[PDB]
Design a protein around this ligand. Structure first.
Ligand SMILES: [Ca+2]
Ligand SMILES: [Ca+2]
Length: 835
């Protein structure tokens, strides 16, 4: 029989391109020791380990590397009678795929699943682990993408009388498509219904009737959205099936624990037979969303595996010291270190070294690892680059680490490996992720950042977290070379074997290749220490849970999608649908009198809340607000020369305001629990509160991106305009209320002994986007941070609407103002700060 859907990774191989350095032939005379061999060879790829020899692709008892694999090439290697009961499972990632009833006809799927994919359907696959550490895939059927179109606009254009007709028109349009890739589509592939909704833009916008159109496929949806009737605005055609699955099932998360349960008519999840598995899992199920519930109370991460890896390459052209280029057949990967950790316990479980050529690790290294209590390295030796790279990808498929890390693996190691596998060898990669074929496995190097030469990676079912990104984001350093970072962060100074050394070491023999290997392993151990110090997976999963997107999109997609998805949830609840697209300048100088610094706390979010700014509260038209009282019911403000109106919360509440309010409440609840929490809970709660802060701080930016997911440049501009007005108001208030010491003392009598011998004055000397510096001649610094707290409260109360909050941040005893955003000063505690 064999698998229902073909496995595309290699499970057999009998011929391959053999490329190896000739220096590995110490049996050859000296003139024949330079360059690489490069020829075809007709034998099975092999690996050598400790005197034994195996075929790379053979699966059975005596393998050289660990496996967490049930099927291999369509043979079921599970023990006889393997049949674990699954109740709860953890989901770390979610895939979207199309299945076709016809293609699945000989998989014994129950009828309710077949109906969902007749003739085609989107299947949401939840990937994860049981408590027992079994790898699971749960295939959810019955999620449809949908978009909206204005009913009046559609009827007037297409002469539609009823939803049946619209379905005919869309079916017809696809039939007639260029390239004909929708032959066989009928008006049965669509369902249209009439609903009442409101466009999220502008206060005056009335509710209207829309067609809501359900589609079975993302491919069909993307075509309709950019081809069908381009004069008719579409709404929410950009929303993926995963998002509909998450938002349409209250409580569902993209990362967390679930339980299988009975569905509506006591339906049950159906276990798939092994030959119908779509992924490299131990167990697979078919279900609908009603067979799933969130499992509250479960919070511990299951035993996911982390692979930390690093490659070493050897340029083999005319210059041994040239940077290696993957397209050059002679520029080889020569080693790969691969450390496998349990992500729940942080324990290092396996230390693997893949070596092109024989490789004898130094006894000193082996003794050191033993002393540190770490696993004894397994050295896998190979005769050619292909055999080695195939073994590494074989390990990736068979062990299936859910998380992968390294240092600069996104910009160097993965691109280099995948360039060799695709361009030199012609290995398809689409079965090397979690899916057994047809899965995403792609790197794309990205533009604009042309100097930094950045990249993204997507590998289905694998979360790649590059520690270089984590550390450049999190720590300020002069150099982000791994050795410099290991000194700065781990306080773990170590030697560098330089790239200049590698060619001479490689050529010497197995002992010196062993020195290369030691240094490659030490590289990966350091990265592992960095990973387990910063725990970036806990940060990223916190954001994924909050934003309703998978952890993969959390890493690689930008800030906008986070806010968008949260907005989409709220907007739907409220009946909206989202359409598819000088006096503050510093006079430079040195001040020896104290300079108090007042900062607004989360200024832009606070403005959005305080002034009820939103897409939905804005009007560009005075007649929109003619029924309302000025001041009492709306804010009128000039922004870029236009008059804008924003109605107040009692007229209509801002969606953005609701999001921010609710997040800030949630962050307050979390930060209140941290002091009573146990130390592991404190780590999780800390990751959660931090995730909330990043999403809140992204709302302003979300509104200001022209050509973004849902721009409202009017909101963005209003925020900066109110910002500027607030700083000026603060300056004016300070200049007026506290021009004399008597007035200061009258408000704060603890000032009475802070009075220094010099003349009293209080003046704003600098102001940036959210802070103001106040020069307090005639006051001593000592009590001034306390009086500053009270000045800040006082101003906040006098001038501004909650939740706007001015705070006294610090006091400089001495300060050098250089320019905008450039200053040096000493804080009252004696510490120097430079910006
Ligand atoms: Ca690396
Ligand atoms: Ca390296």
């Amino acid at each position: 029989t064999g698998p229902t859907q073909r496995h595309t990774y290699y499970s057999e191989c009998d011929e391959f391109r053999f490329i190896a350095p000739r220096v590995l032939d110490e049996d050859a005379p000296p003139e024949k020791r330079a360059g690489v061999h490069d020829g075809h060879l007709k034998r099975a790829p092999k690996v050598y380990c400790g005197g034994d020899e195996r075929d790379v692709l053979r699966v059975g008892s005596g393998g050289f590397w660990p496996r967490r694999s049930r099927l291999w090439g369509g043979v079921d290697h599970a023990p006889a009678g393997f049949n674990p009961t699954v109740t709860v499972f953890h989901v770390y990632d979610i895939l979207e795929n199309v299945e076709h009833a016809y293609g699945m006809r000989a998989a014994q799927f129950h009828a309710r699943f077949m109906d969902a994919i007749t003739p085609t359907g989107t299947v949401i696959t939840l990937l994860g682990l049981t408590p027992e550490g079994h790898r699971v895939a749960v295939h959810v059927y019955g999620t449809r993408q949908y978009f909206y179109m204005n009913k009046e606009e559609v009827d007037r254009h297409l002469q539609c009388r009823a939803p049946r007709d619209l379905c005919e028109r869309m079916a017809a349009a696809l039939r007639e498509s260029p390239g004909a890739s929708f032959r066989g589509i009928s008006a049965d592939h669509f369902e249209a219904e009439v609903v009442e909704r409101t466009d999220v833009y502008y206060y005056e916008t009335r509710p209207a009737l829309f067609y809501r159109v359900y589609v079975r496929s993302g491919r069909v949806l993307s075509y309709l959205c950019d081809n069908f009737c381009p004069a008719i605005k579409k709404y929410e055609g950009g929303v993926d099936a995963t998002t509909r699955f998450i938002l349409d099932n209250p409580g569902f998360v993209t990362f967390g624990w679930y339980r299988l349960k009975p569905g509506r008519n006591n339906t049950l999840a159906q276990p798939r037979a092994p030959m119908a598995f779509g992924t490299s899992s131990d167990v697979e199920f078919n279900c609908t969303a009603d067979n799933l519930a969130i499992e509250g109370g479960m919070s511990d991460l299951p035993a996911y595996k982390l692979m930390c890896f690093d490659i070493e390459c050897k340029a083999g052209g005319e210059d041994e010291l040239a940077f290696p280029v993957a397209g050059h057949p002679e520029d080889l990967v020569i080693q790969i270190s691969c450390l496998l950790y349990d992500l729940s316990t942080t324990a290092l479980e396996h230390v693997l070294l893949f070596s092109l050529g024989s490789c004898d690790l130094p006894e000193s290294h082996l003794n050191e690892l033993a002393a540190r209590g770490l696993p004894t390295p397994v050295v896998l030796e190979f005769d050619s680059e292909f055999e080695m790279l195939l073994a590494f990808m074989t390990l990736v498929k068979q062990y299936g680490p859910e998380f992968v890390t390294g240092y600069n693996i996104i910009n160097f190691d993965w691109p280099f490996l995948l360039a060799k596998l695709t361009d030199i060898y012609k290995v398809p990669l689409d079965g090397y992720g979690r899916m057994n074929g047809r899965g995403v496995f792609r790197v794309w190097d990205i533009g604009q950042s042309h100097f930094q030469k950045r990249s993204k990676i997507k590998v289905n079912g694998m979360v790649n977290i590059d520690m270089y990104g984590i550390i450049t984001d999190k720590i300020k350093l002069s150099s982000y070379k791994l050795n410099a970072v290991a000194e700065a962060v781990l306080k773990d100074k170590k030697k560098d074997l330089s790239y200049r050394d590698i060619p001479a070491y490689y050529a010497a023999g197995p002992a010196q290749r062993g020195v290369i290997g030691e240094y490659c392993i030490q590289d990966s151990l350091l990265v592992g220490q960095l990973f387990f110090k910063f725990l970036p997976h806990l940060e990223l999963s916190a954001v994924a849970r909050l934003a309703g997107i998978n952890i993969t999109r959390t890493i690689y997609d930008g800030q906008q999608i986070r806010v968008f998805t949260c907005l989409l949830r709220l907007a739907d609840q409220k009946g909206f649908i989202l359409p598819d697209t000088r006096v503050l300048d510093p006079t430079s100088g040195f001040h020896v009198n104290p300079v108090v610094v007042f900062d607004f706390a989360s200024l832009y979010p606070s403005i959005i809340q305080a002034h009820n700014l939103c897409f939905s509260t804005l009007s560009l038209r005075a007649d929109a607000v003619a029924h309302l009282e000025a001041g009492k019911d709306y804010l009128e403000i000039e922004v870029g020369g236009r008059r804008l109106f924003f109605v107040k919360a009692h007229v209509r509440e801002s969606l953005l305001s609701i999001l921010l309010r609710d997040w800030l409440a949630m962050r307050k609840q979390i930060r209140s629990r941290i002091p009573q929490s146990s130390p592991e809970e404190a780590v999780l709660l800390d990751k959660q509160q931090a995730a909330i802060k990043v999403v809140c701080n992204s709302v302003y930016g979300f509104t200001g991106v022209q050509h973004g997911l849902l721009p409202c440049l009017h909101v963005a501009a209003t925020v900066t305009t109110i910002g500027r007005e607030m700083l000026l108001a603060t300056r004016e208030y300070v200049h007026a209320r506290w021009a004399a010491f008597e007035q200061l003392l009258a408000d704060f009598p603890e000032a009475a002994d802070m009075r220094a011998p010099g003349p009293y004055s209080m003046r704003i000397i600098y102001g940036d986007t959210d802070s103001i510096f106040v020069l307090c001649r005639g006051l001593t610094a000592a009590g001034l941070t306390a009086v500053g707290d009270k000045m800040a409260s006082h101003i906040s109360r006098a001038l501004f609407l909650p939740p706007i909050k001015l705070e006294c941040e610090k006091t400089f005893t001495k300060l050098l103002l250089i320019a905008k955003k450039k200053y040096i000063g000493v804080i009252y505690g004696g510490k120097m700060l430079i910006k």
